[PDB]
C-alpha cells in the first residue's frame, strides 16, 4: 500500500467515523426527547430541563459532525483523484519508455526493409509452388488426358443446362490505355 | 491507543458510570417509597420518617448524578472532536508532503515533455501499421482482385435495395476558408 | 445534504470523463501490444523462410 | 457517452481491418508451412527411389 493510499484510507475512515458520530447523536437526541416527556408528566421540572439541554446539545452536535464528515469526504475524494492519476501517469511514463526502446531497435527503415523482404520471399515461394504443380501435372499427364476432362465438363454442363462450350477456351479501360501508349 | 484516546475512553466511561448511578438512585427511591407505605400502615412513624428521608435524598442524588453525567458527556463529545480532527490534520499533512515530493520529481514541464513524446510515438506506430497493411495488401493482391470486390458489394447492395453505386468512388466551412486563403 | 448532492453529481462527471480518457489510452496501448507481436512474428517468418 | 460511442464505433473498424490483414498473412504462412512439408516429403521420395 502506497504512502498516499495509507492517507486515503485514513481519511475515508475518518469521514465514516464522523458520519457514525452524527447518527449516534440523532439516536440519542430522540431518546432524550422521550425522557423530557416522562419528566414533565411527573412534574420533575429540573430533570425535564436537564434532558432538554441534552436534546438541544445533541441536535447541534449532530450537525457539526455531519458537516465535518462532508468536508473530510470532499478531501478524500480529491486525494483519490491524486492516487488514480498518479498511477495513470506512471503507467503512461512506462509506456513511453518501452515504446521508445522498441522504436529504436525496429525503426521505420528497418521495418520497410523487413516488409519488402517478406513480400519478395512470398513471390519466390509462389514461383516454387508453380513449378511443383507443373512437375506433378506433367508426371501424371497420362492419367488425365485433356479430351476426357473436356468431355466430362461438357457432359456436366449439359446436365446443368449451361450453354458454355467446354472444349473451346474461355478491362476496356486497360485496352484504351494500351492504345494510348502505342499512339504517342 | 493514543494518549488522548485513552483520556477519551476514560471520560466516556465516567459519563456512563454516572448515568448508571442516577438510574440506581431512581430504582432505590422507588423502593424506599414502598417502605414508607408499609411503615405508615403499621403506625411505625419513626421508620416511616427514616424511609422518607432516604427517598428524598435519592431523588436529589439522582438529579445530581444525571447533571454531572451530562457535563462529562459534553466534554467527551468535545475531546472526540479533537481526536478526529487530529487524525484528519495529520493525514492532510501527510498528503501535502507526499504530493510535494511527486510534484518535484514529475513537474509540469517534465509532464509536458512526456505527453508530447507519447503522442509523437503513437504517430510513429500509425505510420508503421499503415506500411504493414500496405505490404500485406500488395503481397496478397491476386487473391482479392478489385473487380470481384466491387461486383460483390454491388450484388449485396442490390439485395439490400440500396441505390449507391459500388464500382464508382464514394465541409462547406472548410471550402469557404480555403477560398479566403487564396483570395488574399 | 444539498451541497453533498451537488458535489457528487459533479464528481461523477469528472470520474466518468477521466475513465473515458484512460480507456482511450488503454485502447491505443492495446494496439501497440498486438502490432508488436505481429511484427515480431513476421520478422520470424522472414528469417526462417530466408 | 456520445464521444465514447463514436470512439468505439471507429476502434471496431480498425481492429476489424487489422484482423483481416493478420489473417491474410497467416493464410500465406500456412501455405509455406504446407508446401515446406510437401517439398521435404518429395525430396525424401526422390532419394529413396534413387
Task: Walk me through this protein's architecture.
The structure is cut from a larger assembly and holds four copies of chain A. In chain A, helix 1 packs antiparallel against helix 2 (45-105). Chain A is elongated, with a radius of gyration of 45 Å. The first copy, chain A, is mainly alpha-helical and 184 residues long. Chain A starts with a helix and ends with a helix. Chain A contains five helices and no strands. Helices cover 86% and strands 0% of the residues of chain A. The longest helix of chain A has 61 residues, at 45-105. The interface between A and B is large, with 41 and 37 residues. Chains A, B: Residues 26-48, 171-184 form a coiled coil. Chains A, B: This is Charged multivesicular body protein 1b. Chains A, B: Residues 171-184 are annotated as: Interaction with VPS4B. Chains A, B: It is a peripheral membrane protein. Chains A, B: InterPro entries: Snf7_fam.
Annotation, overall tally of beta strands of chain A: 0
β-strand percent of chain A reads under 5%
Largest interface, counted by CB within 8 Å of the partner chain's CB: A-B, 41 and 37 residues
Q: Strand pairing plus helix content of chain A: what structural class?
A: mainly alpha
| Alpha plus pi helix count of chain A | 5
Q: Alpha-carbon distance between the termini of chain A?
A: 79 Å
Radius of gyration of chain A: 45 Å
Q: What general form of chain A does the structure show?
A: elongated
Fraction in helix of chain A: over 70%
User: What summary fits the major beta sheet of chain A?
Assistant: none
Compressed to H and E, one letter per element, the order of chain A equals HHHHH
User: What kind of oligomer do you see?
Assistant: part of a larger assembly
Region (Interaction with VPS4A, MITD1 and STAMBP) (chains A, B): 171-181
Motif (MIT-interacting motif) (chains A, B): 171-181
Region (Interaction with VPS4B) (chains A, B): 171-184
Region (Interaction with IST1) (chains A, B): 132-156
